[PDB]
Amino acid sequence: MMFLRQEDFATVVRSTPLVSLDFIVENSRGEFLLGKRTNRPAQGYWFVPGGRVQKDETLEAAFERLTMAELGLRLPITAGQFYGVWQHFYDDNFSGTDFTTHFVVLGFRFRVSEEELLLPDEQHDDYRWLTSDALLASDNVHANSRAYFLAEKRTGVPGL
Amino acid sequence: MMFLRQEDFATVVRSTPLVSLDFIVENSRGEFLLGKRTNRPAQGYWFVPGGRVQKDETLEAAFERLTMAELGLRLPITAGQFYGVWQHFYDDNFSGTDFTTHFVVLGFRFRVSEEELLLPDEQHDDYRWLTSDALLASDNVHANSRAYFLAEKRTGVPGL
Numbered sequence: 001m002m003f004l005r006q007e008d009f010a011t012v013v014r015s016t017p018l019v020s021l022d023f024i025v026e027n028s029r030g031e032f033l034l035g036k037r038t039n040r041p042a043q044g045y046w047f048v049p050g051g052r053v054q055k056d057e058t059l060e061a062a063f064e065r066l067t068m069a070e071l072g073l074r075l076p077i078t079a080g081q082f083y084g085v086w087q088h089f090y091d092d093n094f095s096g097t098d099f100t101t102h103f104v105v106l107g108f109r110f111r112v113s114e115e116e117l118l119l120p121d122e123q124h125d126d127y128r129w130l131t132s133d134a135l136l137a138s139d140n141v142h143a144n145s146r147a148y149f150l151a152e153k154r155t156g157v158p159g160l
Numbered sequence: 161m162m163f164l165r166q167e168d169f170a171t172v173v174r175s176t177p178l179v180s181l182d183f184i185v186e187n188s189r190g191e192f193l194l195g196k197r198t199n200r201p202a203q204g205y206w207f208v209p210g211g212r213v214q215k216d217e218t219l220e221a222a223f224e225r226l227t228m229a230e231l232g233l234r235l236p237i238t239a240g241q242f243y244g245v246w247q248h249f250y251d252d253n254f255s256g257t258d259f260t261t262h263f264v265v266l267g268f269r270f271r272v273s274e275e276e277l278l279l280p281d282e283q284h285d286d287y288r289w290l291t292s293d294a295l296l297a298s299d300n301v302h303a304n305s306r307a308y309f310l311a312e313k314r315t316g317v318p319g320l
C-alpha cells in the first residue's frame with residue numbers, strides 16, 4: 001500500500017486518474033447515506049461515501065478498509081452489489097485551483113443498519129439520510145451522487 | 161489527452177494504480193489476439209492488447225484512441241462487451257526493477273475480421289491468433305491474459 005506525501009500526491013492528481021470506490025448505502029427505511037465535503041475538490045456539496053484505492057492494494061482489501069473508514073463498519077466486497085464503472089471530473093483539487101481531479105469509480109450498493117455505523121461522535125452531523133426522491137430534489141447533492149439515482153445516467157455505464 | 165514525461169510517469173507508476181482497457185479480440189475462426197511484450201514489465205510474455213487511460217480522458221475517448229493504437233481499427237466503446245474489472249500486478253516497471261506496476265483493468269470482449277487489423281508479417285512473430293484451449297496450455301501466455309478464459313478466475317470479478 002502507499003499513502004503519499006502532499007508533494008507526491010499533488011503530482012499524481014495532476015498527472016493521472018485516481019481510482020475510487022463509492023458506496024450507495026441504504027438503511028432499513030429506504031434512505032440513502034450522504035456526507036458533506038467541506039474541503040476541495042468541490043467543497044460545499046453532499047456526496048455518497050467513498051474513497052481512493054492505493055498503490056498495490058487489491059479492490060477486495062480496499063473495500064474492507066474503505067467501508068470501515070467511511071461508515072465505521074468493516075464489510076467484505078461480497079456484501080456489495082457492483083454498480084458500474086463511473087467517472088468523476090472536478091475543476092479543482094485537494095490543494096487548490098491549479099489543476100483538475102479525475103476519478104475512475106467503482107460503485108457498490110448495499111444495505112446497513114444505522115445502529116451498526118460506529119463513527120466518532122463529533123462527526124455525526126456530517127451525515128444525513130435521504131430517500132431517493134428527496135436527494136434528487138436537494139440543491140445540495142452533487143451531480144456525481146445524483147447520477148446513481150437517475151435512469152438516464154445509468155445509460156452506457158460499463159457494468160450496468 | 162495527457163502523455164507524461166519519463167520522470168512524471170515514473171512517479172505515477174511508483175505511487176498509484178494505473179487504469180487500463182484490455183481487448184479480448186476474437187476472429188472468425190474463434191482464435192484470440194495476443195501480442196508479444198517487448199519491454200518491461202513482464203518482458204517476453206504474451207498478452208491480449210490494451211493500454212492505459214490518461215488524465216482527464218473519458219473511457220469513451222480512451223477506447224477509440226486505444227483500439228486504433230493497438231489494433232489499427234477505430235472502434236467506439238459500444239462495440240465492446242464489458243467483461244469485468246480486473247487487477248494486474250507486476251514485480252517490475254517500464255524503467256527497471258526499482259518499483260512495482262499496478263493496473264485496475266476494464267476488460268472488453270469483441271469480434272473482428274483478422275483482415276482489417278494493422279498487423280505485421282507473421283514471420284516476425286510479434287502477434288499470434290490462438291484458440292482459448294491453446295493459450296490456456298501455454299505458460300508463455302501471461303496469467304493475467306489466461307485469466308480471461310478461466311471460469312475459476314471469473315468468480316469475484318466486479319461486472320462478471
Ligand SMILES: Nc1nc2c(ncn2[C@@H]2O[C@H](COP(=O)(O)OP(=O)(O)O[C@H]3O[C@H](CO)[C@@H](O)[C@H](O)[C@@H]3O)[C@@H](O)[C@H]2O)c(=O)[nH]1
Binds near residue numbers: 004005047048144
Ligand atoms: N496526502 C495524501 N492525501 C490523500 C491520499 N489519498 C487520499 N488523500 C486525501 O485524503 C482525503 C480522504 O480521501 P479518500 O476518502 O481516500 O478519497 P476522496 O477524495 O474522499 O474520494 C471520494 O470522494 C470524491 C468526491 O469528493 C469522489 O469523487 C470519489 O469517488 C470518492 O468517493 C481526501 O481529501 C484526499 O484528497 C494520499 O495518498 N496522500
Ligand SMILES: Nc1nc2c(ncn2[C@@H]2O[C@H](COP(=O)(O)OP(=O)(O)O[C@H]3O[C@H](CO)[C@@H](O)[C@H](O)[C@@H]3O)[C@@H](O)[C@H]2O)c(=O)[nH]1
Binds near residue numbers: 162163165181248
Ligand atoms: N513516458 C510515458 N510512457 C507511457 C505513458 N503511458 C503509457 N506509457 C508507456 O507506453 C507503452 C504503451 O502503454 P499503453 O499501451 O498505454 O499501456 P500498456 O503498458 O501497453 O498496458 C497494457 O499491457 C499490460 C501488460 O504489459 C496490461 O496489464 C495492461 O492492462 C494493458 O493491456 C508502455 O511501455 C507504457 O509504459 C505515459 O503517459 N508516459
Ligand SMILES: [Mg+2]
Binds near residue numbers: 049050051070
Ligand atoms: Mg472519502
Ligand SMILES: [Mg+2]
Binds near residue numbers: 209210211230
Ligand atoms: Mg499497449
